[PDB]
Design a protein around this ligand. Structure first.
Ligand code: HEC
Ligand code: HEC
Ligand code: HEC
Ligand SMILES: [Zn+2]
Ligand SMILES: [Zn+2]
Ligand SMILES: [Zn+2]
Ligand SMILES: [Zn+2]
Lengths: 137, 264
């Protein structure tokens, strides 16, 4: 009762079905997005709705309003693997386990055997998506 | 984005101008309008640390390098100076490194020249490439080219090595799928969390990092940069990182050798 990284179905980048079958928890989404070892989204994106996060990056436009720009399904596909929406994007795939060059074991600098653990698990993705849906207006 | 500023170091023998902004080498002309030292992307308090030798914490390790250059540390009491006299004997060398050696035809980073003398001529076990003996010695040697334009050769016998480094530079490593170029080329001037991205130049190495309170070599920097893409990294002084050092050095051709720089 998870769809595994290699089983995900992207259609024009979008993923129509829940990766877990369980509702996203947006408060946990926020934690995931602002914790360095998890989503680390704020390394590249500002989030105006979260004013207490310090040193937000300027690599990509702010996340405010992404709830208006994309459907839930689009947002799931972007979080899981943004390369299926924006070809060659600098945004890394958070639900991807193989097809890497010199795959590593965490930040150890040692070889990691593919398939790797995905950077975020399936419920973490759903949690991030549920928060992204609220970013409106 | 890179600050408007100029760098002239106060020293014991007068001001030395450092070129920190200049036209790129021809191979980068479609890539950058301008190449910049990493100094330009630092805050003013950090920039000020490089502006004079009295305040530059790297000069402690230059001086210790000079002690080691003069020390009879060989098996028969040999010292660097016993053969090379003053360290000014190495004038210009740092500016043109890495290079294909004129006599052996081997690609050499500075660490390789130092260890050739250490092992063959002083009878010593090779120094670790990120050992204090090595970082201090590179610091001392690098100072002997301060203010000289970086001018690394990329054609002729250098070309295959340079090409091998170029490939590494643009390879998107690790689970994060990121290349040197993704950060240092596509995103120079931007903030990645609290860090202001530079062009990832090495004209300023060896470098005192304020974080570590110590010197760092380009080889050691590279180890960390690839590791942090969530990848299997390369060994410091490995053939592939020697090639990368050649390639990355040449991206700053025209910038001055800083001698020993200060960074976060
Ligand atoms: C942590 C999990 C996240 C989340 C939730 C998002 N990002 Fe990124 N992102 C990056 C770049 C360069 C782009 C633009 C794509 C391109 O044109 O190349 C994006 C795009 C997005 C979007 C869509 C754009 C929008 O705001 O509507 C969304 C919703 C999104 N991201 C969410 C870059 C990065 C990173 C740099 C390495 C990091 C880390 C992240 N993104 C992380 C996240
Ligand atoms: C003490 C540890 C040192 C250090 C730091 C260096 N040397 Fe030597 N060196 C010697 C000879 C005959 C050469 C070759 C000269 C040539 O190729 O024409 C070298 C070379 C170097 C280099 C490279 C110089 C270059 O221009 O290619 C460097 C950086 C270097 N050395 C540093 C001779 C001796 C010795 C005689 C026995 C002794 C002792 C040392 N060197 C010691 C040191
Ligand atoms: C691919 C292997 C490389 C190489 C060769 C380099 N980098 Fe990075 N780098 C990143 C950040 C945030 C910093 C600190 C801020 C800055 O000065 O740019 C660096 C630093 C460096 C340096 C030091 C430059 C100096 O002037 O002291 C060098 C030589 C360097 N890098 C080389 C960030 C990233 C990445 C972001 C995720 C990636 C990928 C790379 N770097 C990759 C590489
Ligand atoms: Zn001073
Ligand atoms: Zn010489
Ligand atoms: Zn010679
Ligand atoms: Zn190789």
């Amino acid at each position: 009762c998870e769809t595994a990284p290699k089983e995900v179905v992207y259609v024009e980048g979008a993923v129509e079905a829940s990766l877990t079958g369980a509702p996203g928890n947006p408060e946990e989404g926020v934690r995931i997005m602002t914790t360095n070892a998890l989503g680390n989204c704020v390394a590249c994106h500002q989030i105006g709705a979260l004013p207490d996060v310090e040193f937000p990056g300027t690599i990509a436009p702010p996340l405010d309003g992404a709830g208006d720009r994309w459907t839930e399904a689009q947002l799931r596909g972007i979080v899981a693997n943004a390369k299926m929406t924006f070809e060659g994007t600098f945004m890394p795939a958070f639900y991807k386990v193989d097809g890497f060059v010199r795959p590593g074991d965490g930040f150890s600098g040692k070889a990691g055997a593919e398939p790797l653990a995905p950077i975020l698990n399936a419920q973490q993705i759903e949690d991030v998506v549920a928060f992204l849906v609220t970013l409106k207006e | 984005d890179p600050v408007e500023d100029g760098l002239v170091i106060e020293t014991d023998s007068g001001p030395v101008e450092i070129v920190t902004k200049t036209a790129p080498p021809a191979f980068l002309a479609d890539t950058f309008d301008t190449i910049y030292s990493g100094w330009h992307f630092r805050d003013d308090s950090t920039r000020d640390l490089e502006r004079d030798d009295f305040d530059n914490p790297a000069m402690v390790f230059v001086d210790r390098g000079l002690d080691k250059w003069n020390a009879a540390m060989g098996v028969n009491g040999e010292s660097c100076a016993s053969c090379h006299q003053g360290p000014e004997s190495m004038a210009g060398l740092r500016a043109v490194m890495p290079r294909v050696d004129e006599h052996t035809g081997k690609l050499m980073i500075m660490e390789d020249y130092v260890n050739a003398c250490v092992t063959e001529r002083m009878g010593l076990e090779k120094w670790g490439v990120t050992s204090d003996n090595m970082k201090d010695m590179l610091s001392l040697i690098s100072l002997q080219s301060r203010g000289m334009a970086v001018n690394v050769k990329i054609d002729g016998p250098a070309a295959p090595y340079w090409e091998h480094g170029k490939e590494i530079y643009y390879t998107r490593y690790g689970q994060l799928e990121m290349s040197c170029a993704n950060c240092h080329e596509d995103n120079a001037g931007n903030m990645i969390r609290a860090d202001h991205l530079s062009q990832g130049q090495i004209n300023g190495f060896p470098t005192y990092r304020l974080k570590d309170s110590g010197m760092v070599t380009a080889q050691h920097r590279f180890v960390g940069c690839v590791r942090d893409t969530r990848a299997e990294t390369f060994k410091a002084g490995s053939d592939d990182f020697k090639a990368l050092e050649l390639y990355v050095a040449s991206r700053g051709n025209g910038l001055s050798v800083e001698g020993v720089s200060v960074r976060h």
